[PDB]
Amino acid sequence: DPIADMISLTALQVLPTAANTEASSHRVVPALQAAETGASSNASDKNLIETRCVLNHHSTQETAIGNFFSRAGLVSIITMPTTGTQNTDGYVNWDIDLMGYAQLRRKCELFTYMRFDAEFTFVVAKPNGELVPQLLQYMYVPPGAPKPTSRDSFAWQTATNPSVFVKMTDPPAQVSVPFMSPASAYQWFYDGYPTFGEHLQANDLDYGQCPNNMMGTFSIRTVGIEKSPHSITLRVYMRIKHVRAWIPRPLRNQPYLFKTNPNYKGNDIKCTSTSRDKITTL
Amino acid sequence: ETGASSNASDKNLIETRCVLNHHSTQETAIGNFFSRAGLVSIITMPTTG
Amino acid sequence: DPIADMISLTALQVLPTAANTEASSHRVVPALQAAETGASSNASDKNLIETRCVLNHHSTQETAIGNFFSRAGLVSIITMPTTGTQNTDGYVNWDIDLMGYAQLRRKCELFTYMRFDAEFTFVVAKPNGELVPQLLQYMYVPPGAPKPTSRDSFAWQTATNPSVFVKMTDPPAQVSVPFMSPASAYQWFYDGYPTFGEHLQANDLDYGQCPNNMMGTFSIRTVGIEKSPHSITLRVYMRIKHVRAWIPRPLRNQPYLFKTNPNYKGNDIKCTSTSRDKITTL
Ligand SMILES: CCCCCCCCCCCCC/C=C\[C@H](O)[C@H](N)CO
Ligand SMILES: CCCCCCCCCCCCC/C=C\[C@H](O)[C@H](N)CO
Ligand SMILES: [Cl-]
Ligand SMILES: [Cl-]
Ligand SMILES: [Cl-]
Ligand SMILES: [Cl-]
């Protein structure tokens, strides 16, 4: 008491259908905007022209981020060939990174942060699309859990990790996954480094790598002591569900080159829009 | 020396802020820890051997 | 509200006379003290011996700091000789520093800070004690005011500074002075430097100098266009009044050497107490 110096405006609204149009006539300066402020023109039809009444029942439900994202998309293709350089071992460990396929990636990168649960579907077959009576095991190996070093590895005992056993002939396996980041949300962009220290050019592959997005390894194998005679192709589809998103940003307008960064082909910088001869001719 | 674990917490050794902690303890319930199918046996019936 | 971490025991007493003594008998451990704490024994007569009742009316009024300090003491001796090296000029400018005389100085240095008003008395005469019909002018020249450069100096016009005109034959001149420091109190000890910068050995005379104690200059002259034939001796006495004091400290036990610092003769360090031959003999 003996010292006197020690004593968000915007909100939501539910709009199920597009706004309507009201009538007006031959009649305050609402046509000229001060776009220098960083605001979008609040001028509508009724201001610049004479209008009729239109009872607009067009629905806005399909543009809800949920209907936009909750569509299963390809995020990975894993192959286990029998003859070659890949894995004549009968098993494969895949670091989880969903940024290897553009269609989905570009959609997510529309936002800076995203939080959601997901439905993963596992479509498996031979490289030509044929199916055979082969038993498989998919296992989720969280960060810290021991990764299988072979098709015989004890890790396939899967006493605590979650594993799925399914035949290549059964329908696609399918499961639900919760929001697992240790942060409040996954983030497609992390303008920083994961650790302290000097950031010499040798460790610049560190830039942009966010541990909170690193969900571990996904392992798969044929279930047998002996090698399987079949080459295997596994396509993993992901369907986002129960999603929330923050901070929209410009959409990628240059082809993707790498999973972990926004590097672009500097010699061939594509223009966002097609070109024409003259500004006065279509 | 008694065989007891320190009943001293944050508020005792340092100045703290109020934190409304909603972290759930359901996953460490022995049921969620054990109710995960695990391999307990491998039985083989070969034809030649 | 959305954050929960953002939401003197001793007093005075009036004792006009010394505390009394009450009776006791042949009877809790009040004789043994824990002086390790930094406390003075709260054990009195009634605890260590059998006592009688004594109605003690001894007064504590004389030990009040006011009666202790409000006794005029010599703080300066200013001389204006006619034949010599001093001031055959007829005027003198004296920087005000009251630390040139021990009796008073030691008393004040009992405290660290002191605030008070004062009564200055000016006893003037010839060097042999004789008096003559000589007119004098004493003037207070505050910091910033122009100091007289001669007996004719315009500064003696004293249009704003306060001046006193008195004859060497009139009784001593006497005036009251207010508490003039720009600080809350004068301080006999200032453990620091007056300005910023490096404190090279060339400017070490700065250490301990506190501007808040520098009250300016005291000027005096004979009132005449012509030189006076009389040597003059001025003794200035000061009587502290309306005083308050803080933070008592050890009393000087070494002879004073300089006005502005506590330097002491290192080769001859005096013991606070006289000595004897044996610790078992008086
Ligand atoms: C037995 C079923 C196993 C299925 C387990 C799959 C868990 C996958 C969790 C989805 C994690 C979202 C992706 C997060 C971050 C991005 O990939 C990062 N940019 C990679 O550094
Ligand atoms: C015409 C009458 C003129 C009389 C004016 C006398 C004013 C003197 C004010 C008393 C100041 C107290 C002394 C203060 C500080 C000490 O002298 C310091 N240690 C000096 O550096
Ligand atoms: Cl096994
Ligand atoms: Cl959703
Ligand atoms: Cl004059
Ligand atoms: Cl007083």
Ligand 2 atom 4 nearest Cα: C140
Integer angstrom CA distances of residue A65 from A10, A15, A74 = 20, 14, 19
- CA angle C53-C57-C60, nearest 5°? 130
C-alpha A240/C-alpha A71 separation (Å) is: 7
Best probe of the A interface among B27, B30, B36, by most A CBs < 10 A, is: B36
C145 DSSP assignment: S
CA distance C177 to C171: 19
Give the C-alpha separation, A147 to A220, whole Å. Answer: 11
Rounded Cα gap, residues C264 and C258, in angstroms: 9
Selection from C159, C157, C171, C178 nearest residue C221 by Cα: C157
How far apart CA A143 and CA C203 sit, in angstroms, is 66
> Which experimental technique did the depositors report for determining this structure?
X-ray
Write the CB contacts of C232 (distance below 8 Å, at least 6 apart in sequence).
Answer: C79, C80, C81, C124, C125, C126, C127, C134, C136, C168, C222
- Nearest atom within ligand 1 for CA of residue A162: 1
Q: How far apart, in whole angstroms, are the C-alpha atoms of residue A161 and residue A145? A: 8
Distance CA C67, CA B19 (A): 61
**Radius of gyration for chain C, computed over Cα atoms and rounded to the nearest angstrom:** 27
Give the closest residue to C89 by CA, choosing from C151, C138, C139. Answer: C151
Residue A84 zone, left/alpha/beta (φ > 0; ψ -120 to 50; rest) = left
Q: Which residues of A22-47 are buried (b: 16+ CB within 10 A; e: fewer)?
A: eeeeeeeeeeeeeeeeeeeeeeeeee
- For residues A218 and A141, give the distance between their C-alpha atoms in angstroms, rounded to a whole number: 6
Count chain B–chain C contacts defined by CB atoms under 8 A: 7
Q: Where are the alpha helices (DSSP H) in chain B?
A: 10-13, 30-34
3-state secondary structure of A116: strand
Binding-site residues on chain B for chain C (CB distance < 8 A): 16-18
Q: Could you count the other beta carbons within 10 Å of the beta carbon of residue A162?
A: 14
Q: How many CB atoms lie within 10 A of CB B44?
A: 6
Angle, CA C199 vertex, CA C196 and CA C202 arms, to 5°: 130
Any idea what the CATH number is for the domain that residue C86 is in?
2.60.120.20
Instruction: Work out which ligand 1 atom sits closest to the CA atom of A122.
Output: 2
On the 0-12 / 13-18 / 19+ scale of CB atoms within 10 A, C100 is middle
Q: Give A159's contacts in chain B (Cβ within 8 Å).
A: 36, 38-39
Ligand 2 pocket mutation pick from C74, C76, C96, C99 by most atoms within 8 angstroms of CB: C96
C142: tokens are 């505050």
The one-letter amino acid at A108 = C
Helix (H) or strand (E) holding A66: helix A65-69
Distances (CA, A) of C139 to A70, C144, C197: 96, 14, 36
Rounded Cα–Cα distance for residues C65 and A257 (Å): 88
What the block records as the tokens of B25 is 């303890």
Write down the H helix ranges in C45-141. 45-48, 65-69, 102-108
Resolution, angstroms, 1 dp = 2.7
Q: Which chain B residue shows the shortest CA-CA distance from C4?
A: B18
d(CA A94, CA A219): 6
Atom of ligand 2 nearest to the CA of C96: 17
For chain B, the residues before each gap (C–N > 2.5 Å) are none
State the residue for tokens 């994202």.
A69
| A213 Cα to the center of ligand 1, angstroms | 7
Can you tell me whether residue A212 is helix, strand or coil?
A: helix
Contact list in B for residue A162 (CB cut-off 8 A) is 36
Scanning C16-78, the segments in alpha helix (DSSP H) are 45-48, 65-69
Q: Which residue of A has its CA nearest to B23?
A: A182
Domain total of chain A? 1
C161 vs C144: CA distance, rounded Å: 11
Residue identifier of the C-alpha nearest atom 4 of ligand 1: A140
Separation of alpha carbons B11 and C22, rounded Å: 50
Q: Quick one: DSSP state of residue C219?
A: E
Do residues A228 and A167 lie in contact, with contact meaning Cβ atoms separated by under 8 Å? no
Nearest to A253 by CA among A269, A237, A240: A269
Q: What tokens does A55 get? A: 């009872």
Q: Domain residues for A190?
A: 1-282
* Separation in Å, CA of C245 to nearest CA in chain B: 39
Coil/strand/helix, residue B28: helix
Residues with CB under 6 A from ligand 1: A 96-99, 118, 120, 138, 140, 162, 164, 175, 177, 180, 186, 213-215, 218
Length of chain B in terms of residues written: 49
- Which residues are bridge partners to A91 per DSSP? A221
Q: Which residue has the tokens 């629905």?
A: A59
Q: Which chain A residue lies closest to B41 (C-alpha atoms)?
A: A157
